[PDB]
Write a protein that binds this DNA or RNA. Structure first.
Lengths: 131, 236, 147, 129, 774
RNA sequence: GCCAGCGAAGUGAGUUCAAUGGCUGAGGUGAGGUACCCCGCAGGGGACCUCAUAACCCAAUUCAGACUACUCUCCUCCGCCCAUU
RNA sequence: AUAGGGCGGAGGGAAGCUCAUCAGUGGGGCCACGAGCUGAGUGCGUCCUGUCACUCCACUCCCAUGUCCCUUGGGAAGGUCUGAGA
């Protein structure tokens, strides 16, 4: 039933309810996929220099990333560390995210099925440490 | 839309060169091109190792803005008055293939005609010092703008005199009114260690020359990349 | 009932910090009026007698914020590069350079000044490599984080 | 198609080389190497060796070294892991005319340990799951 | 010290600027009344001083030292006399207090907010909380034996092409179904309409022996359309009194309506109810957290043990069984477990969960707009994973207020709220929560959530929302605690951006069908014609010279005739809402690339392959096809409503492949001979004084739509706007497949979805990309 | 008649020592001229060039309504005077 | 009768030209996931051993810090008017 003709949506991956708080005192940056690289790096450069304009005050940032977004996140981070030109501390945190996929064909006898997957997420944490 | 590309006429010693490079990198520049004035009286050709920037500077110039590595070009400004000296420059089209942008400086109207007609140059230098009147014919200017010839206007009369300011502003207004203003870039020479101006100020200074409220900045920011591409296609 | 003002920032770039110490409002105003009177006539300089005025000045920093009108800021900003040969008690050669032209709006002009000051601090750090200035840099970063 | 890769774990490799761990490298893109490295991890869990596991990855494999080293953390249940992020220069020569190009790639290193980091962490702050 | 004094000077200048702008932005011209935030400004502070806070009132009194008739009637009787004409919902007065209320096809509803919040509604829709008022959904309750209602739904279902709702029976116990119903089973492609469907089977029978309920929820014009369909299909047989029901329904209650009849022959009991219960759609991730913190389950312990004096005996009769206490405990535990979940975004498809809730005005926090996140304690990860994997609320799906007599006994309580406001002030507590409980409101409510953009693979489950289902008595009382927590309210414009941002068509009338779409198009055309005759000439551009028959949204009825004539030479409104063929169209229109074999990836885990005869065989069984398309602007474009989608030529392909950043070519001008005819009509009119056509209306719709423009137009856009979900122009428009198959057969080469569009006010063509993600 | 406030992010423009209707070209409309093109009811339609597209005034939280200041502009009720049958 | 020419006054919840390029100020927007989490295929090893290599098979190419997009003072934005946003 999952081979002939079926509906395959990907629902969501849990991050936390942290990003309701994270853009207030610290800064958080989520890297999406296939949108733009240069726009993400420009928003990183804009949010990094923000003092009393960005959110409240730039003190520390950390960037979230999933399976390929970890690669685009390490790319924007290692280009931002070359671009911002200041001595900044970069520490990465590895975590496990549970992914749930749903599948169901359109038939009056079949039943839906849920597949489990595990993904590796990174948190790239940049501190403003004295040079 | 590559900004911060202008030309300089500056070589005295290594200390003044480092000072002008640091000043240009601090204020408003991301590509520095050094001209070398060669007149028709000396007729000297030293091309192999005259300058040696990378062996003497320290690994990077850093700017206050985008913090990008500056590309440094070595250009040659040849003052050509005699027609035989122009034939000497015709002989150098295959002998020594260096000095990416070749900049001729004409003084004869027939020589300026064959410069825009047959002679393979990149950017024609037009400066007027001490009573140099010069007319312009429109079809060679049309062939020049169809080809890609960007007209250089090197200015620095602001510290020395005021009559030189008068002759430069008169030549600039005549060029803007006759040439119609399609591809003309203005640049500064550096003999004294402080003969440089602002990066955004080039727009209003070409506005004082004329050409538009905006096409001075638009024309320099387009035609410098166009002139680098034209010199690259001439080299390759 | 109001008039749209324009403002401009200019940095004095020179060595020999006696030139950095030699600043005054009346002296700078008379200097700008005298160097516009050489470039422009009565119509250019007298419009600067009513519209142009000194607004913000720093001695050591060298950033000058000046006012200018709607129909005259092109003339003022075209008269700015021709400020040459300031004669004073010593033999000095100061010179202005434009950072960015802000269309009025003093608040974001002060916002852009803070980012420009942070760029002037952070870029100078790696090329010098000296701890005596680095301690004052750390104190300045700490005092900015206390704000 | 000849590539040379220069790495710019520089001060950190010293205390590890004092104890000689097992080194892991993931070049670009390879499938059965994940199973082979998990087999060596399962073997070295039983073999007599100190608590020090080193993972390294460059290029596109900077995602894959995040994945497989996660899986061992679901089995070995390690405590202190340092993830270091550095520049790596890849100078490769290829043919279309032979041309060489120098790219800059991220390089990701994972250091699993328990007792070597216990006097450590005033500065680095590794995660402690 | 050169560089040291420079460092101190730069630090002093940075400190001075950073303090100066921060003090000056909060100063606001040294005025205390302008120091307040701009969302919290009231202009009546000069008349009375109580419009400012007390700490600010102590300054405003010193600032004041420095510086029409009454209602003479019963206002309830005036509201009843006005409610005799209109509907006047319980929260309609709350909306009309601070929102624009415009009369519509049914009742008068909220179009736009009074305050400018168009960016703020999207910013509250992404991360924050936002709710709506959805009361127009009329409900058909059908009762009957298990074998007969399945036949009554099989006469209407069309499972073979549509989505499964009736005979599936596995999706029914956990969640609901949401799809489009059809007409009588002749299958003519005539009648269609979206209907949200609800099953419920009780846990104890487990066999076809008891009475099975089913619910239809739909739209009022759809109610007028489908009520006749059900009737033809199944069987052809002195104190203040608050008008909770509708006065149209209350006046028709003696002759006809609500429509609650039975059937002796087939045993089908039909209950058409216009306003029986209400539904509220709370959209937002933080909405789930504040719904956890505000809505709380009532305690079954203290009432169930010994507390019983005087009525609400039904809770005693329910709590008499020992299974109800453990059932309410499991419902409260699963509700707290849902509260432990960080978002309502991870949930399979529209789940249903109902429980008994102590009313959220018990707490009533003293502050206003007090929005907080969760505490950092986020434990119990195993039960969250168990609820996310299976998610089986069979036992917790409790139908208590769905009955005929119990819900009316709930509604008969007639609770007041101003007196309940006064009882809190009589207790004189400063900041504590104290509500006496000899008689509490221990009533159950339902939660049906909604995932949005499940079909679209661009965002994969964007719109996460909840639906609070509640009786008609408990209305605005449950509205206002969320408003005090800080939930924002959006009108029909917020539903329109919910449609166009999620790339779904609007369910009232923006999709074309025969009874609803045509009347809604004519109603919108009356407003556009009023704005057209309202504007004088020399302001608007003429559509004769530059464009074509725009923006009147019914020319495609003769466009598809020209397409089928062009097909056959060399039934109406057939919408291909069949998901298999839509995935086949997604396989061509989505990927536009060539690497080795297929689009965007060579393995693909799919079936790539070209056959044009199999594509032409689709048009033989499906005449006059019309499919909606999500189109995306690449660069340099802002779409308007009613943009016409034009087929690109080969020269446009060459000029776009030659150089990047290339704008579309201009449209040539057309002949306009009608101006002399309108001048002759004006001369004849002024002659006769001493067919009204002003500037581009005429009775020539047939020969033009065939061939007028230089390019071939095939597509009509209803919602053309730029979305902040992408950061460019993102439009949604209806096209025909007979023009798309020629586009797909014209280019086996590079980019194929790049198809131009033309707005009616402009002469510029702008290219976009076609996507069909269903 | 009296009685009811919320210090925390950021208005399909949101500034406050107070930004935002800038230039060019073609079409819209009010007009004039024709040595251009097509069709045969003296003519009709399209094409080319020029002029005019102003004033009132300027937002600081929004909306509804009322007011006052308008004339490139459109739908009507009209008046007076001049000329014709 | 020709509202042919000139002027004035009244009423309409009357409206106060658009588009594209170059350029100036300010604002907004730019969505954690390649079904590569024990991935697949090939050559030596191997059939129960890969500090082996290859294919950007998922093109994400490019010194990447914006050659990205949108719009931007109306009928009246003016009255020391009314009312509402409790």
């Amino acid at each position: 039933g999952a081979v002939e003709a079926e509906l395959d949506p990907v629902e969501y991956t849990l991050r936390k309810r942290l990003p309701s708080r994270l853009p207030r005192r610290p800064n958080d940056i989520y890297v999406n996929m296939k949108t733009d690289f240069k726009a993400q790096l420009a928003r990183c450069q804009k949010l990094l220099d923000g003092g009393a304009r960005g959110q409240n005050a730039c003190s520390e940032i950390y960037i979230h990333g999933l399976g390929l977004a970890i690669n685009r996140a390490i790319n924007i981070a290692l280009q931002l560390q070359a671009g911002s030109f200041g001595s900044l501390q970069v520490a990465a945190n590895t975590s496990t995210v549970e992914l749930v996929d749903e599948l169901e064909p359109e038939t009056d006898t079949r039943e839906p099925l849920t597949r489990i997957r595990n993904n590796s997420a990174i948190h790239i944490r940049v501190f403003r440490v004295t040079p | 839309a590559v900004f911060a590309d202008l030309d300089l006429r500056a070589g005295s010693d290594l200390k003044a060169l480092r000072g002008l490079v640091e000043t240009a990198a601090h204020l408003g520049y991301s590509v520095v091109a050094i001209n070398h004035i060669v007149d028709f009286k000396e007729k000297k050709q030293e091309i192999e190792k005259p300058v040696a920037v990378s062996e003497l500077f320290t690994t990077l110039p850093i700017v206050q803005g985008k913090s990008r590595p500056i590309k440094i070009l070595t250009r040659l400004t040849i003052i050509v008055s005699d027609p035989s000296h122009c034939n000497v420059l015709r002989a150098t089209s295959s002998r020594a293939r260096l000095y990416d942008v070749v900049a001729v400086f004409p003084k004869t109207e027939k020589l300026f005609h064959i410069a825009c007609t047959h002679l393979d140059v990149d950017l024609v230098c037009i400066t007027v010092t001490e009573k140099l009147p010069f007319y312009f014919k429109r079809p060679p200017i049309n062939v020049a703008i169809d080809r890609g010839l960007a007209f250089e206007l090197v200015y620095s009369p602001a510290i020395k005199d005021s009559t030189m300011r008068r002759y430069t502003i008169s030549s600039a207004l005549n060029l803007m009114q006759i040439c119609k203003g399609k591809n003309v870039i203005i640049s500064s020479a550096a003999e004294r260690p402080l003969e440089i101006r602002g990066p955004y100020d080039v727009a209003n200074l070409g506005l004082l020359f004329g050409l538009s409220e905006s096409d001075a900045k638009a024309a320099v920011s387009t035609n410098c990349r166009a002139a680098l591409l034209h010199g690259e296609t001439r080299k390759t | 009932v109001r008039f749209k003002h324009r403002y401009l920032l200019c940095e004095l770039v020179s060595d020999d910090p006696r030139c950095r110490l030699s600043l005054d409002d009346r002296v700078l105003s008379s200097l700008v009026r005298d160097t516009i009177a050489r470039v422009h006539g009565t119509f250019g300089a007298a419009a600067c007698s009513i519209g142009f005025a000194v607004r913000y000045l720093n001695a050591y920093t060298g950033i000058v914020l000046l006012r200018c009108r709607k129909e005259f800021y092109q003339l003022v900003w075209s008269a700015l590069p021709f400020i040459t040969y300031l004669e004073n008690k010593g033999h000095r050669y100061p010179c202005f350079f434009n950072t960015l032209h802000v269309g009025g709006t003093i608040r974001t002009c002060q916002k852009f000044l803070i980012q420009y000051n942070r760029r002037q601090l952070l870029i100078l750090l790696q090329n010098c490599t000296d701890e005596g200035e680095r301690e004052a840099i750390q104190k300045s970063v700490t005092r900015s984080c206390l704000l | 198609m000849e590539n040379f890769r220069k790495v710019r774990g520089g001060p950190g490799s010293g205390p590890f080389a004092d104890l000689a761990p097992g080194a892991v490298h993931m070049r670009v893109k390879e499938g059965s190497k994940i199973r082979n490295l998990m087999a060596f991890a399962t073997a070295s869990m039983a073999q007599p060796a100190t608590r020090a596991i080193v993972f390294s990855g460059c290029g596109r494999a900077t995602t894959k070294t995040v994945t497989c080293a996660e899986i061992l953390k679901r089995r070995l249940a390690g405590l202190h892991q340092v993830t270091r992020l550095r520049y790596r220069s890849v100078r490769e020569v290829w043919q279309s005319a032979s041309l060489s190009v120098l790219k800059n790639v991220p390089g990701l290193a994972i250091l699993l340990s328990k007792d070597a980091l216990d006097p450590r962490q005033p500065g680095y702050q590794p995660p402690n799951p | 010290k050169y560089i040291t004094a420079s460092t101190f000077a730069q630090a002093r200048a940075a400190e001075i600027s950073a303090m100066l702008k921060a003090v000056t932005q909060k100063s606001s011209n040294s005025l205390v009344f302008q120091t307040l935030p701009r969302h919290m400004r009231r202009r009546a502070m000069s008349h009375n001083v109580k419009r400012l806070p007390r700490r600010l009132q102590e300054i405003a009194q010193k600032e004041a030292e420095k510086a029409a008739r009454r209602c003479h009637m019963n206002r309830t009787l005036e509201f009843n006399r006005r409610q005799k004409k209109n509907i006047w919902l319980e929260t309609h007065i709350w909306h009309a207090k601070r929102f624009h209320m415009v009369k519509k096809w049914g009742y008068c509803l909220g179009e736009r907010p009074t305050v400018k919040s168009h960016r703020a509604c999207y910013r509250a829709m992404t991360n924050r909380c936002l709710l709506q008022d959805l009361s127009y959904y009329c409900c058909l309750e059908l009762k009957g034996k298990e074998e007969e209602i399945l036949k009554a739904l099989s006469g209407m279902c069309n499972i073979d092409t549509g989505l499964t709702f009736a005979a599936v029976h596995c999706l029914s116990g956990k969640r609901q179904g949401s799809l489009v119903l059809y007409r009588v089973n002749k299958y003519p492609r005539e009648m269609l309409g979206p209907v949200t469907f609800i099953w419920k089977s009780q846990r104890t029978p487990g066999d076809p022996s008891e009475s099975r309920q089913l619910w239809i929820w739909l739209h009022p014009t759809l109610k007028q359309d489908i009520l006749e369909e059900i009737k033809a299909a199944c069987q052809c047989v002195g104190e203040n009194a608050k008008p909770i029901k509708k006065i149209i329904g209350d006046g028709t209650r003696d002759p006809c309506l609500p429509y609650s009849w039975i059937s002796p022959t087939t045993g089908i009991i039909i209950s058409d109810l216009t306003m029986e219960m209400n539904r509220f759609r709370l959209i937002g991730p933080l909405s789930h957290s504040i719904l956890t913190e505000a809505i709380k389950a009532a305690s079954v312990h203290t009432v169930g043990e010994d507390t019983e004096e005087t009525p609400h005996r039904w809770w005693i009769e329910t709590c008499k069984k020992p299974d109800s206490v453990s059932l309410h405990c499991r419902q409260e535990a699963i509700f707290e477990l849902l509260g432990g979940i960080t978002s309502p975004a991870e949930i399979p498809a529209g789940t249903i969960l109902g429980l008994t809730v102590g009313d959220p005005r018990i707490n009533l926090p003293q502050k206003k707009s007090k929005a907080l996140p969760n505490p950092e304690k986020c434990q119990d990860n195993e039960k969250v994973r168990q609820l996310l994997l299976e998610g089986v609320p069979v036992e917790c799906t409790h139908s208590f207020i769905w009955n005929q007599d119990i819900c009316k006994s709930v509604t008969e309580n007639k609770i007041s709220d101003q007196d309940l406001n006064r009882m809190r002030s009589e207790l004189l507590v400063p900041g504590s929560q104290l509500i006496l409980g000899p008689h509490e409101s221990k009533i159950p409510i339902l939660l049906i959530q909604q995932p949005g953009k499940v079909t679209g693979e661009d965002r994969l489950g964007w719109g996460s929302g909840w639906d609070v289902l509640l009786p008609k008595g408990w209305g605005m009382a449950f509205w206002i605690p969320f408003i005090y927590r800080g939930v924002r309210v959006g009108g029909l414009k917020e539903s329109a951006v919910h449609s166009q941002y999620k790339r779904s068509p609007n369910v009232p009338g923006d999709f074309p069908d025969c009874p609803a779409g045509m009347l809604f198009a004519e109603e919108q055309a009356k407003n556009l014609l009023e704005k057209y005759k309202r504007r004088p000439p020399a302001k608007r551009p003429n559509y004769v010279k530059l464009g074509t028959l725009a923006p009147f949204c019914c020319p495609w009825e003769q466009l598809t005739q020209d397409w089928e004539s062009r097909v056959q030479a060399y039934s109406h409104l057939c919408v291909l809402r069949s998901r298999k063929l839509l995935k086949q169209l997604s396989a061509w229109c989505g990927p536009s690339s060539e690497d080795s074999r297929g689009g965007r990836r060579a393995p693909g885990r799919g079936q790539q392959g070209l056959t044009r005869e199999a594509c032409l065989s689709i048009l033989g069984h499906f005449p006059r096809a019309l499919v909606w398309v999500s189109l995306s602007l690449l660069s340099k474009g802002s779409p308007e409503p009613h943009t016409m989608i034009c087929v690109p030529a080969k020269e446009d392909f060459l000029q776009l492949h030659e150089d990047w950043h290339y704008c579309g070519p201009q449209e040539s001008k057309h002949s306009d001979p009608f101006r002399s005819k309108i001048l002759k009509q004006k001369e004849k009119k002024k002659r006769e004084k001493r067919e009204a056509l002003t500037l581009g209306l005429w009775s020539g719709p047939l020969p033009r739509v065939t061939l007028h423009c230089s390019r071939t137009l095939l597509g009509f856009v209803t919602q053309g706007d730029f979305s902040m979900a992408v950061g460019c122009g993102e439009a949604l428009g209806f096209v025909s497949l007979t023009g798309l198959l020629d586009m797909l057969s014209s280019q086996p080469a590079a980019q194929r979805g790049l198809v131009l569009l033309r707005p009616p006010a402009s002469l510029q063509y702008r290219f976009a990309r076609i996507a069909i993600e269903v």
